[PDB]
Write a protein that binds this ligand. Structure first.
Ligand SMILES: [Ca+2]
Ligand SMILES: [Ca+2]
Length: 119
């Protein structure tokens, strides 16, 4: 397993910033808010998990982008943190940017991101 905390990544966008509740992590508020870091991959295919939460009862959606290509998304509904998992995602090998980004914000929720895990 490879686990990287959101709070240790590059944080970007107009509003993105760290939070301490409901976990140590990062809040994404508006479209183009993101966290990213560079990951070396020896292998092409991983199960990918992100722990996160919504700011409210709504469903926060976070895109997963690897090497600039969107490979899936994670949905977090409600304020209680959950772990969301994409199974068997194939992506580029070598050094690749990993980004968790908002693209579907509409002023009804914010997304809280705790960590990403590759297995
Ligand atoms: Ca928002
Ligand atoms: Ca964290």
């Amino acid at each position: 397993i490879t686990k990287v905390e959101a709070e240790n990544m590059k944080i970007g966008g107009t509003y993105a910033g760290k939070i301490s509740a409901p976990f140590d992590g990062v809040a994404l508020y508006a479209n183009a808010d993101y966290v990213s870091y560079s990951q070396y991959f020896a292998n092409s295919t991983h199960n990918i998990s992100v722990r996160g939460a919504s700011s409210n009862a709504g469903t926060a959606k976070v895109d997963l982008v690897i090497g600039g290509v969107t490979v899936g998304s994670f949905n977090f509904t409600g304020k209680t943190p959950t772990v969301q998992t994409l199974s068997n995602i194939t992506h580029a090998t070598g050094d690749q940017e990993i980004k968790l980004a908002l693209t579907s914000d509409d002023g009804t929720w914010d997304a809280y991101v705790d960590f990403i895990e590759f297995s």
